Design a protein around this ligand. Structure first.
Ligand code: YCH
Length: 261
């Protein structure tokens, strides 16, 4: 189709490897570009960790208010929110928000610990029908994004389906789903990524990711005004370990998708 020709041209122009999956929930139609190739998730994996904790809170009703101590040894490479609470506590809700809306890596590591390790995050994915997602490492090493390395990867198709289930479907309880949606809509790191290629009137909830090999990712739920929502996953990675981030590619891919509707 036209859209696949334009995405291929965008990829060729970029020098990297682009993966896209769009689900249009109006008719459950899908548009895929390298949809079944693995890509490093980087911080897009934070959505699964937060959702796993939300799932736990369906039974442990006060879990999100549980205080968690932030110690100096907990700080890793990128901790914009946790840094503000060193030698204090943050609740699991605050850690989830920080991981999602600021991409805080300490917060992610606390979520992973709450789940019993990366295997606990992966298990949640399996429990909701995602056979592809795998989380193998903690922060910051899950961002190494080494070509060919299957650790800490998923495919665009899988992540789009899972994001749909978590936000628009019923993989989570009603209060938990709403909380996740609220968190995603409040993301602060996404202005130059998918959002930049979409009409300013559309409501977007997204989670970005960035890593080595110039890996530049964004996953989003999109609520166009007067129109069924869309789920869009855009993954991008490059052949040079020290490549620069290319958020413009994700914006352009979103623009191409949006034009086709
Ligand atoms: B994710 O990908 O978003 C930012 C942090 C930086 O390590 O990880």
């Amino acid at each position: 189709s036209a859209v696949q020709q334009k995405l291929a041209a965008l990829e060729k122009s970029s020098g990297g490897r682009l993966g896209v999956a769009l689900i249009d929930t109006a008719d459950n139609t899908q548009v895929l570009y390298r949809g079944d190739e693995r890509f490093p998730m980087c911080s897009t994996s934070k959505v699964m960790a937060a959702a796993a904790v939300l799932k736990q809170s369906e039974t442990q009703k006060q879990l999100l208010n549980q205080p968690v101590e932030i110690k100096p040894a907990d700080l890793v490479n990128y901790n914009p929110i946790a840094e503000k609470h060193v030698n204090g506590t943050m609740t699991l809700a605050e850690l989830s928000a920080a991981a999602l809306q600021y991409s805080d890596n300490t917060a992610m590591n606390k979520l992973i610990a709450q789940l019993g390790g990366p295997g606990g995050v992966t298990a949640f994915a399996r429990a909701i029908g995602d056979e592809t997602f795998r989380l193998d490492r903690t922060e910051p090493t899950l961002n190494t994004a080494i070509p060919g390395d299957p650790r800490d990867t998923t495919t665009p198709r899988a992540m789009a389906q899972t994001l749909r289930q978590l936000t628009l479907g019923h993989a989570l309880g009603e209060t938990q789903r709403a909380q996740l949606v609220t968190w995603l809509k409040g993301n602060t790191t996404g202005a130059a990524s998918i959002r930049a290629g979409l009409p300013t009137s559309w409501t977007v909830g997204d989670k970005t990711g960035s890593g080595d090999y110039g890996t530049t990712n964004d996953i989003a739920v999109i609520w166009p005004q007067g129109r069924a929502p869309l789920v869009l996953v855009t993954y991008f990675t490059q052949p040079q370990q020290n490549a620069e981030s290319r958020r413009d590619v994700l914006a352009s891919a979103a623009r191409i998708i949006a034009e086709g509707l």
